[PDB]
């Protein structure tokens, strides 16, 4: 059936991958991506054109981001530390439109999320520092990126936080879900 | 001309990439791969089918590996710690056949190497621990992988080591360069 776990989440097009590890803490190997397993998992062909690597401190929240033109699927993981990663379904006519799912991803649990075109995406850093990396199917373009505010009362995402997040001005100024332009 | 440095090494098909960083140590972003920049750099189209992530302790040397069937280009980087990474040209009729190049790659310098099909590849870990990741154009298959011994007197690679490396039995039993089957 495979040789890295794939799990459909409450929103079925959002998928959680868990690679099999070979070795232990002193010395290990794992596949962080296999085209065959991945394409068999999500049901269609995918091409990744860009990889993006970032480092953010504790409590930094980046989201909820999405591009309507140059739409992107994103396969996300943590190589250092721990994030809580969130996908919001924004697809015209989706039976789960306006719903969110969230998973803790870390360098320890080695978990990943596939967030297809049509979703908004965000994460908050829970560890002292987190290094986050993702593969996209089209290029990150700021002039096309849109944003829904992290703490929108209608989505009412359950961020595992005890303190206020540290947001950029842009994310602070995120649109309310109500007011958001969504995907055709 | 770009927006991540690309440098041809003494063997010109082996390429060193350096991403531009946005931010600083407390919080940064960089592109670890851009299809356009990469394909413009190496002169042809490339497809990556598999990503592999590993953790190895100080002084562990893995190499010098290559696959004759299911031949692979490899784009390699360190996300934790520091390796010395080595590419050996094994292409039939190459004007630099039997030559090596080596660069220190680390999470600090963010440098990467493209090692095309036709080369052997190896690294030694210099920091307390190193996490190494690479993208290949075809799948890692042990039944096809071959090996030249790290300390071959003819290649005479200049490993920046003060102590003996820790090798697997397989790499200990690597072929002498003289005796090695190479690439058509």
UniProtKB/Swiss-Prot annotation, chains A, B:
One of its GO terms (molecular function) is dTDP-4-dehydrorhamnose 3,5-epimerase activity. The keyword Hydrolase does not apply. GO terms for biological process: dTDP-rhamnose biosynthetic process; lipopolysaccharide biosynthetic process; lipopolysaccharide core region biosynthetic process; polysaccharide biosynthetic process. Substrate binds at residues 26, 31, 50-52, 62, 74, 121, 145, 170. Keywords: Carbohydrate metabolism, Isomerase, Lipopolysaccharide biosynthesis. It catalyses: dTDP-4-dehydro-6-deoxy-alpha-D-glucose = dTDP-4-dehydro-beta-L-rhamnose. Pfam families: dTDP_sugar_isom. InterPro entries: RmlC-like (IPR000888), RmlC-like_jellyroll (IPR014710), RmlC_Cupin_sf (IPR011051). It comes from the Bacteria. Pathway: Carbohydrate biosynthesis; dTDP-L-rhamnose biosynthesis; Bacterial outer membrane biogenesis; lipopolysaccharide biosynthesis. Transmembrane segments: none annotated. Homodimer. Catalyzes the epimerization of the C3' and C5'positions of dTDP-6-deoxy-D-xylo-4-hexulose, forming dTDP-6-deoxy-L-lyxo-4-hexulose. Belongs to the dTDP-4-dehydrorhamnose 3,5-epimerase family. This is dTDP-4-dehydrorhamnose 3,5-epimerase. It comes from Pseudomonas aeruginosa (strain ATCC 15692 / DSM 22644 / CIP 104116 / JCM 14847 / LMG 12228 / 1C / PRS 101 / PAO1).
């Amino acid at each position: 059936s495979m040789a890295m776990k794939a799990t459909r989440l409450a929103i079925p097009d959002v998928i959680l991958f868990e690679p099999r590890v070979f070795g232990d803490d002193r010395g290990f190997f794992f596949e962080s991506y296999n085209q065959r397993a991945f394409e068999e998992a999500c049901g269609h062909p995918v091409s990744f054109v860009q990889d993006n690597h970032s480092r953010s401190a504790r409590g930094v929240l980046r989201g909820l981001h999405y591009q309507i033109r140059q739409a992107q699927g994103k396969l996300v993981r943590a190589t250092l530390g721990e994030v809580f990663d969130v996908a919001v379904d924004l697809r015209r006519g989706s039976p789960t439109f306006g719903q969110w799912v969230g998973e803790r991803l870390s360098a320890e649990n080695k978990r990943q999320m596939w967030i297809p075109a049509g979703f908004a995406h965000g994460f908050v850093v829970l560890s002292e520092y987190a290094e986050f990396l993702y593969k996209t199917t089209d290029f990150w373009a700021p002039e096309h990126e849109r944003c829904i505010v992290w703490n929108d009362p209608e989505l009412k995402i359950d961020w595992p936080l005890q303190d206020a997040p540290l947001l950029s001005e842009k994310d602070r100024q995120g649109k309310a879900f109500a007011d958001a332009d969504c995907f055709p």
